[PDB]
Design a protein around this ligand. Structure first.
Ligand SMILES: Nc1ncnc2c1ncn2[C@@H]1O[C@H](COP(=O)(O)O)[C@@H](O)[C@H]1O
Ligand SMILES: Nc1ncnc2c1ncn2[C@@H]1O[C@H](COP(=O)(O)O)[C@@H](O)[C@H]1O
Ligand SMILES: N[C@@H](Cc1c[nH]c2ccccc12)C(=O)O
Ligand SMILES: N[C@@H](Cc1c[nH]c2ccccc12)C(=O)O
Lengths: 299, 291
């Protein structure tokens, strides 16, 4: 089947890409890489980083990611990423790196590492937004350059398209976990009280920026059409609508949150990660060896 | 003991650094790394590179490097180098890299890899010339920066065609230097190629090569060669050069057609891979990588 690779460092992300990944793990060969080596391109607190790595893994498992169907692993645990990244750093031009839209050198040399993350597994598709367009283009250029000289040409395509969830405080802005205003987003780990507060915070009619965003969250999470909801809330106010949407969000997160705690306090977590690295290390190790063979490294 | 690390990409070379290498491996923990990963920072022909890697290893063994005393290995065969190099790339500043006096990103990001080569083995000494001074300074700065935040702080044959330059395989004239693998015919031609007395820039250089290769003093060669021409000197020196490389070349060719070579290299990587592995793991632990 086709290979999918996702490098990971809210409800809008869940809905936007993650929630469909749980169906797609059965059709496609999915790879979920916790890019801890990319994380260190900026200041990091060792304890926090280590903790965030575990949380992310648990969250992905809690959401439905099947460790037997997909490959969930930690980047640093697969040396091939660093090995391949160096080889690619030798074929990439400084100009290409400098041109990047986005002083620690990791901030400039990380693109070749991202290309290695992808190219290492002969991935066909990469579920990324427009913010990663340039990055994907560079990895495609590097793949072509290497191929012609001595990989599958990756493609940036999120396979099952969801809604674009916007911030609760700025309806024209995409909802992001890096928002200065915590009120702008809803975390997969937020508690009932927080969800309500965040959801509760001049037309007065429920028709499809602010209201429309709420409807998208409601629709995708409830399974009801935007028209269905429009009819159901006819002549109704935002209060009840918000009180309603707040309950659906909670009902969605609660099962996820409790699975997250089991994983977080279970030994299976580390066991599952050990297997992921093994599965990944196996595919990547082979690729690195072919790369070295083509370049002339070692024996 | 103290740890020594030497990353490797003429007779002047042997006499310079490598001869004494044949000696210090017994009272020092020496590491001889064939930096093939650094080699790819510039265009390379896969077949040539692969071949050059083998040759270099054989040459180092043929010269006297004891695989049981020192650690001879190929850089790429130890993933820790690339792993540690990335972590160091994250603590180094672009400005520091740009400031380097020495185009793939690799020409600019290779210094952090060289620092990893060194720091990985807690080396105390690095046998390098002034051309690597800046590089050594950067690895010392990186070691200090990492330590404070979260390593060991590490620290003449002229040309034949130009007695004022220096003898160097990088010469466009192959007749300005002598290769350890050069044959008798070549050695003679290169050695044979107005004041007309012998004592001690061309003559002083010849006397130096003669002295260090023969074992006799420069004065010994001076009283020895009282009232002689350059003909007979050049013929004598050229013989000593052949007598020096002969045994070496014989050992070299032996290694180049034996399976013990790959056996020795496998062992080097495994002794190197074990130690570098431990360091990488401590680095990751300090930075918060993985688990
Ligand atoms: N608010 C959102 N709505 C829809 N998709 C989102 C949202 N936030 C993130 N994503 C998707 O989830 C991933 C976010 O990756 P990142 O660039 O680190 O934010 C990409 O696949 C995005 O397209
Ligand atoms: N005459 C010499 N004396 C001492 N070391 C030498 C001599 N010739 C070559 N070398 C060594 O060989 C290395 C080659 O440097 P490079 O020009 O970059 O290839 C130098 O860094 C020295 O360590
Ligand atoms: N650069 C991505 C993460 C990432 C690293 N390597 C990747 C490979 C494929 C997709 C994404 C990635 C981000 O910051 O979000
Ligand atoms: N940079 C050195 C080779 C090298 C790589 N790593 C090293 C570590 C120590 C000493 C030398 C090296 C050269 O070009 O000659």
């Amino acid at each position: 089947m086709k290979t999918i690779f996702s490098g990971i460092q809210t409800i809008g992300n869940y809905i936007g890409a993650l929630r469909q990944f749980v169906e797609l793990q059965h059709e496609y060969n999915c790879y979920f890489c916790i890019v801890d080596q990319h994380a260190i391109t900026v200041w990091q607190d060792p304890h926090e980083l280590r903790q965030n790595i575990r949380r992310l893994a648990a969250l992905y498992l809690a959401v439905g990611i099947d460790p037997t169907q997909a490959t969930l692993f930690i980047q640093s645990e697969v040396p091939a990423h660093a090995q391949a990244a160096w080889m690619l750093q030798c074929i990439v031009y400084i100009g290409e790196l400098e041109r990047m839209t986005q002083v620690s050198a990791g901030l400039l040399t990380y693109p070749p590492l991202m290309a290695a993350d992808i190219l290492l597994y002969n991935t066909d598709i990469v579920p990324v937004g427009e913010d990663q367009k340039q990055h994907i283009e560079l990895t495609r250029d590097l793949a072509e350059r290497f191929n012609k000289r001595y990989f599958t040409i990756p493609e940036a395509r999120i396979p099952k398209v969801g809604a674009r969830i916007m911030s609760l405080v700025d309806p024209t802005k995409k909802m992001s976990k890096s928002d200065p205003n915590p009120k702008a987003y809803i975390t997969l780990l937020d508690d009932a009280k927080t969800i309500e507060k965040k959801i509760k915070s001049s037309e007065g009619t429920i028709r499809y920026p602010g209201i429309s965003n709420l409807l998208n969250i409601y629709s995708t999470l409830s399974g009801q059409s935007i028209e269905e909801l429009e009819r159901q809330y006819e002549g109704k106010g935002y209060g009840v609508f918000k009180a309603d949407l707040a309950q659906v969000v909670i009902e969605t997160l609660r099962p996820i949150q409790e699975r997250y705690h089991h994983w977080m306090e279970s030994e299976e977590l580390d066991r599952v990660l050990d297997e992921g690295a093994e599965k990944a290390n196996r595919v990547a190790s082979e690729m690195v060896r072919k790369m070295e063979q083509a370049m002339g490294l070692g024996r």
